[PDB]
Write an enzyme that holds these catalytic residues in place. Sequence first.
Site, PDB file in Angstrom:
ATOM      1  CG  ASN A 138      16.812  11.404  23.671  1.00  0.00           C
ATOM      2  OD1 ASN A 138      16.209  11.662  22.630  1.00  0.00           O
ATOM      3  ND2 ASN A 138      16.802  12.150  24.759  1.00  0.00           N
ATOM      4  CD  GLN A 197      21.543   6.676  25.482  1.00  0.00           C
ATOM      5  OE1 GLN A 197      21.838   6.424  24.311  1.00  0.00           O
ATOM      6  NE2 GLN A 197      21.306   5.732  26.378  1.00  0.00           N
ATOM      7  CG  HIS A 237      16.381   7.078  29.585  1.00  0.00           C
ATOM      8  ND1 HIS A 237      17.717   6.790  29.357  1.00  0.00           N
ATOM      9  CD2 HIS A 237      16.225   8.390  29.299  1.00  0.00           C
ATOM     10  CE1 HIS A 237      18.322   7.884  28.881  1.00  0.00           C
ATOM     11  NE2 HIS A 237      17.441   8.874  28.858  1.00  0.00           N
ATOM     12  CG  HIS A 264      12.771  11.244  27.857  1.00  0.00           C
ATOM     13  ND1 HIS A 264      13.196  12.061  28.881  1.00  0.00           N
ATOM     14  CD2 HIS A 264      13.873  10.723  27.314  1.00  0.00           C
ATOM     15  CE1 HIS A 264      14.496  12.079  28.909  1.00  0.00           C
ATOM     16  NE2 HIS A 264      14.952  11.280  27.950  1.00  0.00           N
TER      17      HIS A 264
HETATM   18  C1  LIG Z   1      14.815  11.139  38.347  1.00  0.00           C
HETATM   19  N1  LIG Z   1      16.090  11.253  39.013  1.00  0.00           N
HETATM   20  C2  LIG Z   1      17.216  11.613  38.378  1.00  0.00           C
HETATM   21  N2  LIG Z   1      17.185  11.820  37.073  1.00  0.00           N
HETATM   22  C3  LIG Z   1      18.344  12.173  36.487  1.00  0.00           C
HETATM   23  C4  LIG Z   1      19.573  12.365  37.127  1.00  0.00           C
HETATM   24  N3  LIG Z   1      20.552  12.715  36.202  1.00  0.00           N
HETATM   25  C5  LIG Z   1      19.914  12.739  35.042  1.00  0.00           C
HETATM   26  N4  LIG Z   1      18.563  12.400  35.145  1.00  0.00           N
HETATM   27  C6  LIG Z   1      17.586  12.461  34.032  1.00  0.00           C
HETATM   28  O1  LIG Z   1      17.862  11.446  33.090  1.00  0.00           O
HETATM   29  C7  LIG Z   1      17.294  11.880  31.844  1.00  0.00           C
HETATM   30  C8  LIG Z   1      18.145  11.250  30.798  1.00  0.00           C
HETATM   31  O2  LIG Z   1      17.651  11.656  29.503  1.00  0.00           O
HETATM   32  S1  LIG Z   1      18.641  11.461  28.279  1.00  0.00           S
HETATM   33  O3  LIG Z   1      19.743  10.662  28.739  1.00  0.00           O
HETATM   34  O4  LIG Z   1      17.878  11.011  27.184  1.00  0.00           O
HETATM   35  N5  LIG Z   1      19.326  12.991  28.073  1.00  0.00           N
HETATM   36  C9  LIG Z   1      18.932  14.246  28.339  1.00  0.00           C
HETATM   37  O5  LIG Z   1      17.899  14.520  28.882  1.00  0.00           O
HETATM   38  C10 LIG Z   1      19.869  15.337  27.886  1.00  0.00           C
HETATM   39  C11 LIG Z   1      19.293  15.979  26.629  1.00  0.00           C
HETATM   40  C12 LIG Z   1      20.038  17.187  26.137  1.00  0.00           C
HETATM   41  C13 LIG Z   1      20.579  17.379  24.900  1.00  0.00           C
HETATM   42  N6  LIG Z   1      21.137  18.626  24.805  1.00  0.00           N
HETATM   43  C14 LIG Z   1      20.958  19.290  25.993  1.00  0.00           C
HETATM   44  C15 LIG Z   1      21.351  20.573  26.379  1.00  0.00           C
HETATM   45  C16 LIG Z   1      21.030  20.977  27.655  1.00  0.00           C
HETATM   46  C17 LIG Z   1      20.337  20.139  28.533  1.00  0.00           C
HETATM   47  C18 LIG Z   1      19.949  18.871  28.155  1.00  0.00           C
HETATM   48  C19 LIG Z   1      20.259  18.420  26.864  1.00  0.00           C
HETATM   49  C20 LIG Z   1      17.263  13.420  31.838  1.00  0.00           C
HETATM   50  O6  LIG Z   1      15.961  13.893  31.486  1.00  0.00           O
HETATM   51  C21 LIG Z   1      17.711  13.793  33.250  1.00  0.00           C
HETATM   52  O7  LIG Z   1      16.951  14.833  33.848  1.00  0.00           O
HETATM   53  C22 LIG Z   1      19.623  12.135  38.519  1.00  0.00           C
HETATM   54  N7  LIG Z   1      20.601  12.214  39.423  1.00  0.00           N
HETATM   55  C23 LIG Z   1      19.988  11.888  40.624  1.00  0.00           C
HETATM   56  C24 LIG Z   1      18.677  11.616  40.477  1.00  0.00           C
HETATM   57  N8  LIG Z   1      18.410  11.760  39.115  1.00  0.00           N
END
Ligand SMILES: CNc1nc2c(ncn2[C@@H]2O[C@H](COS(=O)(=O)NC(=O)CCc3c[nH]c4ccccc34)[C@@H](O)[C@H]2O)c2nccn12
Lengths: 112, 116
Positions: free
Chosen positions: B89, B96, B102, B104
């Site tokens: 993303n 993102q 990262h 997925h």
């Molecule tokens: C492992 N441990 C771990 N993982 C985390 C933490 N915070 C975020 N993540 C992980 O980072 C990923 C980043 O994906 S990404 O940046 O590509 N973005 C997304 O995943 C958001 C996508 C989105 C777009 N519209 C929405 C509307 C509602 C919900 C989500 C969305 C996500 O899948 C999160 O679950 C965390 N805090 C402590 C430990 N943690």
Amino acid sequence: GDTIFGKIIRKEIPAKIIFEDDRCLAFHDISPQAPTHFLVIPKKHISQISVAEDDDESLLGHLMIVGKKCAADLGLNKGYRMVVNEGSDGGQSVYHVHLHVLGGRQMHWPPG
Amino acid sequence: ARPGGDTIFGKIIRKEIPAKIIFEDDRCLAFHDISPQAPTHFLVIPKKHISQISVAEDDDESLLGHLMIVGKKCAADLGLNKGYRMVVNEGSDGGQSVYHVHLHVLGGRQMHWPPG
Ligand SMILES: CNc1nc2c(ncn2[C@@H]2O[C@H](COS(=O)(=O)NC(=O)CCc3c[nH]c4ccccc34)[C@@H](O)[C@H]2O)c2nccn12
């Protein structure tokens, strides 16, 4: 070459080509799922990411660099999503490795 | 004092914050996502801090490739024999949430089209 993407690489069927080099090709997807939806593929026939070789890593990385440079040139300045599908659960539609790049709208979660 | 940066992912790299680690080498870390969107959903991240794919350098090519190779190897080791989807993303339209590159990897169910 035994796929439609092989025909595209060999210039045997039409595709709107965005970028080409000696090792990959980027072109617009015929069934677009966003206002901008293109593919970046290697010229080497890797059927699926699951069977990519260790010595293919630079090539796979090259697809992503090309993809992000193409996205910038196509004006995707609010962002985009890159996708690789593997196998039936992944919805891999052509057994020639391909990176999707989609933008020009908000992409949602989950990603399918 | 703090290589990998101070995003959550940098803190996971330095074992400052807990994670469920699948695989680790000198270049990357694979760990399960805290908010999984599929029966198996993990992340592959570089140890080098790159904020997003749009600012990756040309000489980051091999590293980015390595994320995908590690991704597919981890998928096989986790028994995702019917396939999976890999996602990167970028920015706001990509969704993102964390500005450390990262990959997925999602599997264990049918993934649908379009991919969001
Ligand atoms: C492992 N441990 C771990 N993982 C985390 C933490 N915070 C975020 N993540 C992980 O980072 C990923 C980043 O994906 S990404 O940046 O590509 N973005 C997304 O995943 C958001 C996508 C989105 C777009 N519209 C929405 C509307 C509602 C919900 C989500 C969305 C996500 O899948 C999160 O679950 C965390 N805090 C402590 C430990 N943690």
